[PDB]
Design a protein around this ligand. Structure first.
Ligand SMILES: *[C@@H]1O[C@H](CO)[C@@H](O[C@@H]2O[C@H](CO)[C@@H](O)[C@H](O)[C@H]2NC(C)=O)[C@H](O)[C@H]1NC(C)=O
Ligand SMILES: *[C@@H]1O[C@H](CO)[C@@H](O[C@@H]2O[C@H](CO)[C@@H](O)[C@H](O)[C@H]2NC(C)=O)[C@H](O)[C@H]1NC(C)=O
Ligand SMILES: *[C@@H]1O[C@H](CO)[C@@H](O[C@@H]2O[C@H](CO)[C@@H](O)[C@H](O)[C@H]2NC(C)=O)[C@H](O)[C@H]1NC(C)=O
Ligand SMILES: *[C@@H]1O[C@H](CO)[C@@H](O[C@@H]2O[C@H](CO)[C@@H](O)[C@H](O)[C@H]2NC(C)=O)[C@H](O)[C@H]1NC(C)=O
Ligand SMILES: *[C@@H]1O[C@H](CO)[C@@H](O[C@@H]2O[C@H](CO)[C@@H](O)[C@H](O)[C@H]2NC(C)=O)[C@H](O)[C@H]1NC(C)=O
Ligand SMILES: *[C@@H]1O[C@H](CO)[C@@H](O[C@@H]2O[C@H](CO)[C@@H](O)[C@H](O)[C@H]2NC(C)=O)[C@H](O)[C@H]1NC(C)=O
Ligand SMILES: *[C@@H]1O[C@H](CO)[C@@H](O[C@@H]2O[C@H](CO)[C@@H](O)[C@H](O)[C@H]2NC(C)=O)[C@H](O)[C@H]1NC(C)=O
Ligand SMILES: *[C@@H]1O[C@H](CO)[C@@H](O[C@@H]2O[C@H](CO)[C@@H](O)[C@H](O)[C@H]2NC(C)=O)[C@H](O)[C@H]1NC(C)=O
Ligand SMILES: *[C@@H]1O[C@H](CO)[C@@H](O[C@@H]2O[C@H](CO)[C@@H](O)[C@H](O)[C@H]2NC(C)=O)[C@H](O)[C@H]1NC(C)=O
Ligand code: NAG
Ligand code: NAG
Ligand code: NAG
Lengths: 425, 204, 163
């Protein structure tokens, strides 16, 4: 019987709080499929090939062929629309400065490599390597794979522009003109977004930079060392080829006829029964093609939903800082980096995880001079003998003064108010 | 501009037209008219011809219903998105980037359209940006000062604190800065005076 | 069948006569007169696509043979296929008519080009400089979303059989 999880009992009490005293910069991967293989089917060539009599019998069924071609064309344009929606979200191609110094933050694994001819990042190069006469057989039966409108190099260029915008300009480029800001100041702004003061980032800048670099290296090692990391994108490729193979395999099906070869049927039977046999082959092949188109449409809907989700993540996680819980990684979200992948996008979510929490005795308010004092932005904590006010997400005790507390009412209403002095500047 | 809604209308009529067109298909039978088949053949072979017409028309109708269901799923997803935009963009102000227009979202207005909704997203776009020299903190009297809500900027000779999204320079005082630590830890701290409001008060 | 018979590098065993693909389609054969192996490759086929502007504007057209090399059919070779009737221009513009593999077509005659992704902007990043907005623009933008479809009901018996 599978275990749901390790058992943890939280030490809940009416007057105790746990405050983090440290943090971990966590980078996590999110892999999203964006597009599929664009397929076009020649209905006449697939069902009948070179046989004129088969085409003549096929004409009796009407506009089935037109419907299948139209549906496949809609899927094919939809895939390009999905790629445009996910990646072509900036109309300026931003570039990084020639001196790659960002206050200790290292972006070598995600920025484009000049040495490589493909102009891809090490992570993107790893992603393309890890996602892989089948093509000839699919082509020879009247089924054609159509090239993506955006080539891999242009998609990589779009990701490079997004990375340059998010690194040099923060979230400004997503909401208008790209405004340059130093990267430590940008990270301080992101720290303010999740409710942590700027001083925490500035004082611990080298530690945060080291943690970020270590996390990025761990991400590259984790992708290189795990076969099932890129399972989703490969699955899409796996489905598409299999579908084409199945459709190709359906040409070798008798469908209740003497033979699967039209030429043999013509060469062996009189037209009254040959017409019947060709009709059986036509109905079986048409059913196979309709089945293939129906699954292609369902998969197209699923990929469109995934692409819409990927576009939403690109807008909210890469082009801004998100306050939505778990949308842009586990933890308090700081920023995100896009990486191109075959038929998809990989988001590196940089999040803030609290760590090394410590118990403190807490009170709702401080009673001083018959007045109740409440924290403006923090929480009251006690280490045993002395009372302090600290920010909720990091332990930084400060003296309780009138500057960081506000007075509302007397001490007779608040339940759990404790008596302590409030300093006056 | 209104290509999407018309496209939906275009698909629906075309689907009905295709289904209507499917009535003119022999489907491997002698005729596409059932009345002719009845008027021309005995029931043992008329049953076969009517069977061919029935299976072809039934396949066409099932195909039409299947694409109608797929389009219904797509339109339901679009309608759910439209309801989410109506709730978050019209009935409130959204902090989600690009959900309610390009730029910093202020408000949105709904307009009815045939088979659809048009959202007029009113957003705030920054413009006429100007370069300034910036510092993470201000060093005064051996203490590090950080902005409460703004950013430190310099026009070349003088230091000010301004709000991030609009240029409004103000004198660096203790009211708009907070002190955390000394000047030895912050990388890039610059030396500047921090004004005290109480100093003229007790001085005078 | 019908196909080109090219020279084959495949070494058949003496008992084998035909050859098949992964997907069970013939890809090779042994000639019964002279014991040699031939690579049966089907003849070229392509999806003829017509690239045109509006008839209100012009009547010039270009033809794209999808998947067909230009030697097997203003002739330009693209990864999408062979494009006849459009002149390649080294300039980059926005995409007007999509061709594929980064190639787009437009009317100015009909030209084919590698589409530009966007205007090139270099952000003046430095470790101590910031850009602060001094003004604003109130921008109203339109977002069009479909909500409902036409409600259709079909009488199954009347549609299939009538009276
Ligand atoms: C806060 O204090 C509580 C209780 O004083 C701690 O909870 C105990 O944790 C240990 C080890 O995890 C358990 O063996 C005890 O049974 C727990 N006691 C109760 C009452 O739950 C808690 O670990 C402290 N938190 C920190 C961060 O030190
Ligand atoms: C917060 O945790 C970090 C680790 O994430 C601590 O940094 C370590 O400090 C020890 C001793 O100072 C060093 O030996 C390690 O090499 C440091 N690790 C890294 C990754 O730099 C840091 O000291 C902790 N801070 C507090 C206040 O506990
Ligand atoms: C940024 O990270 C890259 C890669 O993690 C660092 O490049 C490594 O540098 C060390 C020592 O200089 C070499 O031993 C490694 O072989 C390098 N690896 C790669 C992939 O180049 C780089 O030094 C870091 N710092 C800067 C400023 O770029
Ligand atoms: C709670 O924290 C306060 C402040 O850090 C501690 O008060 C200081 O303790 C040190 C060590 O004994 C003394 O040298 C200082 O003079 C104390 N400062 C003041 C203003 O009294 C206090 O001891 C801590 N209490 C516990 C139980 O840890
Ligand atoms: C907090 O301080 C107040 C004021 O000193 C205390 O209230 C006094 O309590 C004593 C004993 O119960 C009474 O004789 C006084 O009349 C009270 N004064 C007022 C103004 O109410 C209160 O008891 C203290 N609370 C704690 C928990 O120490
Ligand atoms: C901020 O200063 C930088 C550099 O001093 C300006 O960047 C220059 O912009 C001009 C015109 O766009 C170019 O011709 C230069 O080549 C750029 N130089 C560099 C080093 O990038 C930038 O325009 C200034 N910002 C504003 C708002 O005036
Ligand atoms: C930076 O801004 C300050 C404040 O606006 C400027 O100081 C003023 O400059 C004007 C113009 O000469 C003088 O009339 C005022 O008397 C100055 N005020 C003070 C308090 O000195 C300063 O000139 C600006 N510097 C630059 C390089 O633009
Ligand atoms: C900022 O101010 C501090 C303190 O006034 C300066 O530190 C002094 O620097 C001089 C020469 O470098 C030394 O002789 C003093 O002993 C230092 N005093 C202290 C308390 O450290 C610092 O140099 C100033 N920084 C800048 C950039 O002007
Ligand atoms: C901010 O931009 C607005 C325009 O959006 C400026 O207003 C213009 O001012 C000029 C000169 O005073 C007039 O000729 C225009 O008619 C105004 N336009 C509008 C739409 O009212 C405004 O002056 C700018 N402010 C700053 C400080 O740059
Ligand atoms: C908290 O609970 C303890 C025991 O459960 C009790 O003695 C104490 O009065 C409570 N305090 C408040 C403020 O409820
Ligand atoms: C910024 O970099 C310049 C050189 O590019 C250097 O002179 C200066 O000391 C740096 N300032 C900070 C705060 O790192
Ligand atoms: C096939 O025909 C040729 C004709 O010249 C003859 O020489 C040869 O012996 C025949 N048999 C085989 C096995 O090639």
């Amino acid at each position: 019987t599978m275990s749901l999880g390790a058992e943890n009992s939280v030490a809940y009490s009416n007057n105790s709080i746990a405050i983090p005293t440290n943090f971990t910069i966590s980078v996590t991967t999110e892999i999203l499929p964006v597009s599929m293989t664009k397929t076009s089917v020649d209905c006449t060539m697939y069902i009948c090939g070179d046989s004129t009599e088969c085409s003549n019998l096929l004409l009796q069924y009407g506009s089935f062929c037109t419907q299948l071609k139209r549906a496949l064309t809609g899927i094919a344009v939809e895939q390009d629309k999905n790629t445009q929606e996910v990646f072509a979200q900036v109309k300026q191609i931003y570039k990084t400065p020639p001196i790659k110094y960002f206050g200790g933050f290292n972006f070598s694994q995600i920025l484009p490599d000049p040495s490589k001819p493909s102009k891809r990042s090490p992570i993107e190069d790893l992603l393309f390597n890890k996602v892989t006469d089948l093509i000839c057989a699919q082509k020879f039966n009247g089924l054609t794979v159509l090239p993506p409108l955006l080539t891999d190099e242009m998609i990589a260029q779009y990701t490079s522009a997004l990375l340059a915008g998010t690194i040099t300009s923060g979230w400004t480029f997503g909401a208008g003109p790209a405004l340059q800001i130093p990267f430590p100041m940008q990270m301080a702004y992101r720290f303010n977004g999740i409710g942590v003061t700027q001083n925490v980032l500035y004082e611990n800048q080298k530690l945060i930079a080291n943690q970020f670099n270590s996390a990025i290296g761990k991400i590259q090692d984790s992708l290189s060392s795990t076969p099932s990391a890129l399972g989703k994108l490969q699955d899409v490729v796996n489905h598409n080829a299999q579908a084409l193979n199945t459709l190709v395999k359906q040409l070798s099906s008798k469908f209740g006829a003497i033979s699967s070869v039209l030429n043999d049927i013509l060469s062996r039977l009189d037209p009254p029964e040959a017409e019947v046999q060709i009709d059986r082959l036509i109905t079986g092949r048409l059913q196979s093609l309709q089945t293939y188109v129906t699954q292609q449409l369902i998969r197209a809907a699923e990929i469109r939903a995934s692409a819409n989700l990927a576009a939403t993540k690109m807008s909210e996680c890469v082009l801004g800082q998100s306050k939505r819980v778990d949308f842009c990684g586990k933890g308090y979200h700081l920023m995100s980096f896009p990486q191109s992948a075959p038929h998809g996008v990989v988001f590196l979510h940089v999040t803030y995880v609290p760590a090394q929490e410590k118990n403190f005795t807490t009170a709702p308010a401080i009673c001083h001079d018959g007045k109740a004092h409440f924290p403006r932005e923090g929480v009251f904590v006690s280490n045993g003998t002395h009372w302090f006010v600290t920010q909720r997400n990091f332990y930084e005790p400060q003296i309780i003064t009138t500057d960081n507390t506000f007075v509302s009412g007397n001490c007779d209403v608040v339940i759990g108010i404790v008596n302590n002095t409030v300093y006056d500047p | 501009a209104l290509g999407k809604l018309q496209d939906v209308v275009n698909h629906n009529a075309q689907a009905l037209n295709t289904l209507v067109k499917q009535l003119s298909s022999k489907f491997g039978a002698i005729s596409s008219v059932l009345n002719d088949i009845l008027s021309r053949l005995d029931p043992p072979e008329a049953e076969v011809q009517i069977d061919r017409l029935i299976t072809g028309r039934l396949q066409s109708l099932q195909t039409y219903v299947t694409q109608q269901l797929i389009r219904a799923a797509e339109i339901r997803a679009s309608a759910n998105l439209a309801a989410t935009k109506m709730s978050e963009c019209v009935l409130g102000q959204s902090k989600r980037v690009d959900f309610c227009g390009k730029g910093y979202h202020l408000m949105s207005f709904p307009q009815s359209a045939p088979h659809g909704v048009v959202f007029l997203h009113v957003t705030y776009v920054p413009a006429q940006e100007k370069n300034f020299t910036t510092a993470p903190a201000i060093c005064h009297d051996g203490k590090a000062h950080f902005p409460r809500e703004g950013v430190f900027v310099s026009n070349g000779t003088h230091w000010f604190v301004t709000q991030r999204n609009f240029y409004e320079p103000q004198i660096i005082t203790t009211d708009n800065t907070f002190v955390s630590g000394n000047c030895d830890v912050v990388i890039g701290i610059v030396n500047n005076t921090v004004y005290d409001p109480l100093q003229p008060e007790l001085d005078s | 069948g019908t196909g080109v018979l090219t020279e084959s590098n495949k070494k058949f065993l003496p008992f084998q006569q035909f050859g098949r693909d992964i997907a069970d389609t013939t890809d090779a054969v042994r000639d019964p007169q002279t014991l040699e192996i031939l690579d049966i490759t089907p003849c070229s086929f392509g999806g003829v696509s017509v690239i045109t502007p509006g008839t209100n504007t012009s009547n010039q057209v270009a033809v794209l043979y999808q998947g067909v090399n230009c030697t097997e059919v203003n002739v330009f070779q693209t990864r999408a296929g062979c494009l006849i009737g459009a002149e390649y221009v080294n300039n980059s513009y926005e995409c007007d008519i999509p061709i594929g593999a980064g190639i787009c077509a437009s009317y100015q005659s009909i030209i084919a080009y590698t589409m530009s992704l966007g205007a090139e902007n270099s952000v003046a990043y430095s470790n101590n400089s910031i850009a602060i907005p001094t003004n604003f623009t109130i921008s109203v933008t339109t977002e069009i979303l479909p909500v409902s479809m036409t409600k259709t009901s079909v009488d199954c018996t009347m549609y299939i059989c009538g009276d």
